[PDB]
Amino acid sequence: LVMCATAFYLIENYPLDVGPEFSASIIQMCGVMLSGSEESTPSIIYHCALRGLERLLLSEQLSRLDAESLVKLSVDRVNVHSPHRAMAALGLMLTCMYTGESVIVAMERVSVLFDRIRKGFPCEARVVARILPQFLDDFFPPQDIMNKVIGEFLSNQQPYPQFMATVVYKVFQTLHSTGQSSMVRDWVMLSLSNFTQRAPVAMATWSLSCFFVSASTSPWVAAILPHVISRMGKLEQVDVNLFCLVATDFYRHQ
Amino acid sequence: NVAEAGEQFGQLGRELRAQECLPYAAWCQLAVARCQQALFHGPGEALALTEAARLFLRQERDARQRLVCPAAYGEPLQAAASALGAAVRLHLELGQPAAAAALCLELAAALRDLGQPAAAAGHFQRAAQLQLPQLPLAALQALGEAASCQLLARDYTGALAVFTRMQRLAREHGSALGAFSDVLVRCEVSRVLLLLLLQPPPAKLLPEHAQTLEKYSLPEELFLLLQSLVMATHEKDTEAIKSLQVEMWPLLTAEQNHLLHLVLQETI
Numbered sequence: 001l002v003m004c005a006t007a008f009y010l011i012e013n014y015p016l017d018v019g020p021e022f023s024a025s026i027i028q029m030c031g032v033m034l035s036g037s038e039e040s041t042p043s044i045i046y047h048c049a050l051r052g053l054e055r056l057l058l059s060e061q062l063s064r065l066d067a068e069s070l071v072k073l074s075v076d077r078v079n080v081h082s083p084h085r086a087m088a089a090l091g092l093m094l095t096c097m098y099t100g101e102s103v104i105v106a107m108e109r110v111s112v113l114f115d116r117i118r119k120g121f122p123c124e125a126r127v128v129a130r131i132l133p134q135f136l137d138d139f140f141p142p143q144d145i146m147n148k149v150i151g152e153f154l155s156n157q158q159p160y161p162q163f164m165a166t167v168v169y170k171v172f173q174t175l176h177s178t179g180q181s182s183m184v185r186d187w188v189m190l191s192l193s194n195f196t197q198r199a200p201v202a203m204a205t206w207s208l209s210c211f212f213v214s215a216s217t218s219p220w221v222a223a224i225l226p227h228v229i230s231r232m233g234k235l236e237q238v239d240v241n242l243f244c245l246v247a248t249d250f251y252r253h254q
Numbered sequence: 255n256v257a258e259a260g261e262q263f264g265q266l267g268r269e270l271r272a273q274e275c276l277p278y279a280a281w282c283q284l285a286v287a288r289c290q291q292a293l294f295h296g297p298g299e300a301l302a303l304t305e306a307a308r309l310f311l312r313q314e315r316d317a318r319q320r321l322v323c324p325a326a327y328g329e330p331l332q333a334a335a336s337a338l339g340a341a342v343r344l345h346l347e348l349g350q351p352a353a354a355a356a357l358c359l360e361l362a363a364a365l366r367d368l369g370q371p372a373a374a375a376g377h378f379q380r381a382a383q384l385q386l387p388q389l390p391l392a393a394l395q396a397l398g399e400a401a402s403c404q405l406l407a408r409d410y411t412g413a414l415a416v417f418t419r420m421q422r423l424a425r426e427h428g429s430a431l432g433a434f435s436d437v438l439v440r441c442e443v444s445r446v447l448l449l450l451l452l453q454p455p456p457a458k459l460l461p462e463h464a465q466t467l468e469k470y471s472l473p474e475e476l477f478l479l480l481q482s483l484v485m486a487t488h489e490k491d492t493e494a495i496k497s498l499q500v501e502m503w504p505l506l507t508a509e510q511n512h513l514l515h516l517v518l519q520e521t522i
Contacts, residue, residue: 038412039379043372081458083411119457121411159455 001048004030008052012059024066027053031073034089038082050088054095071096078112083124086116090127097139106140114152117164129163133170142175142183150191154199154207165210165229172214173222184215185254202235205243212247221249260289277330280309284337296348303341304357310334311364318368331368335361355384359396366399371406378403379416390427394420394437401444402509410452410516417445418462439472443506446470446480447513450487451520476505487521495521 007026010018030049033041053070056062074092077085093109113132117125136145149171153164175184191211198204213225224246231239263285270279287302310330317326338361345354362377378400385393397420404413421441428434445466454463470481471488479502486494495518502514 038415042376043407043409043412082415084409119455121452121454121458123411123452157457159457 001045004049005052008055011056012061015061020063023062024069027066027069034073034077038080038085043084046085047088050092054092057095057099067096067099075109075112078116079119083121086120087124087127090116103140110136110139110148114148118157118159122160122163125163129166132167133174136171137174142171142180145171146187150194154191154194160232161207162229162232165225168211169214169225188212188215188250202233205235205239206232209243209246212250215253216246216249217253221246256289256292260286263289276309276313277333280306280313280330280333283309287340297345297350300341300344303337303344306337307334307341307357307360310337314364314368331364334364351384352388355381355396358384362399366403366406371403372409375400375403375407375409375412386423390423391433391437394423394434398437398440405509405512410448414445414448414452414454414463417441417448418460421445422462440510442466442472443476443480444510444513446484447510447517450484451513451517476502479505483517487517490521492522 011023011026015023030053034046034050057067057070070092074089074096077089078093080086080089090113093112097106097109113128113135116128120128136142136149149168152158153161153168158164172184175181188211195204195208199207209228210225213221213228216222228242263282267279267282267286270276270282283302283306287299287306290299290302310333313330314326314328314334317323317330338357341357342354345351345357358377358381362374362381365371365374365377378396382393382396385396397416400416401413404410404416420437424430424434424438428438430438445463449463449467467484470484479498483495483498485491486498499514499518503511506514
């Protein structure tokens with residue numbers, strides 16, 4: 001552990017005093033170790049060589065060919081099973097995109113975040129639902145962000161829409177900027193056609209009430225959503241009356 | 255000469271333990287082992303390297319247990335696991351992999367004592383694969399001390415990997431006997447308190463995890479209160495879960511009493 005820590009202190013501060021061939025070969029030795037199994041390289045050796053890799057990228061010293069070697073190793077470790085092992089690998093996918101065909105290659109990185117919701121423990125996927133509201137608003141415009149969310153919200157292989165319910169809420173209220181608040185309205189129309197092909201009858205009506213809340217008026221409809229996503233199943237006579245009130249204020253919102 | 259050089263270093267190491275220094279009697283034992291590489295003594299060459307392992311782990315019960323020093327920082331903890339690196343490699347060349355795993359269960363009972371419970375998880379799994387061909391009940395007691403490490407190290411997801419490996423051998427070796435009949439009582443009371451703690455999705459829910467949760471939704475006293483606790487967290491019943499810890503506290507041991515505490519908080 002102590003011997004990989006002084007390799008990182010040479011590449012940042014003192015590049016030229018060692019060879020340019022020596023900088024790119026400390027990157028490769030943390031591929032074999034970080035893509036080892038959960039018992040081949042221990043958890044204490046795992047978490048300490050990986051935190052030093054996102055240090056060197058934020059330093060402006062590495063070359064353009066030396067930086068993209070770190071991009072490939074971080075994709076293959078998000079889909080390992082241990083989430084404490086796989087929570088640290090999600091931090092490396094950000095910084096390469098935060099130091100940097102432009103439209104095309106960014107398609108592959110975004111769909112890696114959506115699968116950790118599907119496969120992955122609920123101690124892991126609390127982290128993934130706080131980022132992805134804020135994450136999509138920065139990179140690529142909201143006409144492209146809107147297609148991947150709902151089609152991966154409505155799917156039968158969604159283990160719980162409960163933590164996926166908080167993702168969709170924070171998107172629309174940043175889309176309630178004055179330029180794009182009317183473009184909020186067009187996406188509400190297409191998703192209603194998808195419900196007519198049915199989920200189970202208790203389950204299908206719950207997902208309708210969470211959507212119109214996030215696209216509604218400001219003062220009081222928006223605060224209902226943690227009361228809605230509290231009861232996910234378990235239909236009630238009190239549950240039937242709540243669906244009627246929400247989607248009619250949207251009829252006078254048009 | 256070189257035979258007579260080894261007998262001189264043995265008289266020096268014993269007059270120092272009564273003098274009670276012990277990094278230097280610990281340095282006296284590593285001189286006996288460097289001669290027997292010039293000759294070839296074999297299983298007696300590994301006897302000089304593991305009496306130097308007993309003497310660097312006694313310098314650090316006087317630095318982190320008896321004399322708890324904030325300036326103690328593991329120079330005889332780095333010294334303890336390096337004389338045991340040359341010891342395990344020399345049993346395998348002679349071909350006794352059952353003696354190689356006796357020396358690695360001594361290195362990992364110190365790291366649970368010196369407060370390093372994540373690298374203690376570690377070296378317990380190295381000594382089992384050197385025993386699974388040979389002693390499958392000496393190999394299943396090195397994996398029950400590996401589940402007491404990761405719950406100190408708070409590795410609750412890596413703790414599901416080591417509990418399904420204990421139960422897959424007793425259906426190959428035990429079906430249960432005895433010694434293997436008490437290894438299976440500990441592993442179906444503690445894989446049920448983890449799947450409510452962390453409730454896995456159906457992609458990462460294995461076909462072995464699928465079988466045990468249909469049976470609930472081993473002693474007749476404790477088999478009845480575990481079917482009742484998988485129901486409440488699926489009903490989110492705050493009054494049901496509180497009266498069971500009051501009535502399951504004498505039943506479990508305090509390794510299984512730690513996994514029931516972390517469920518009642520993460521549902522309340």
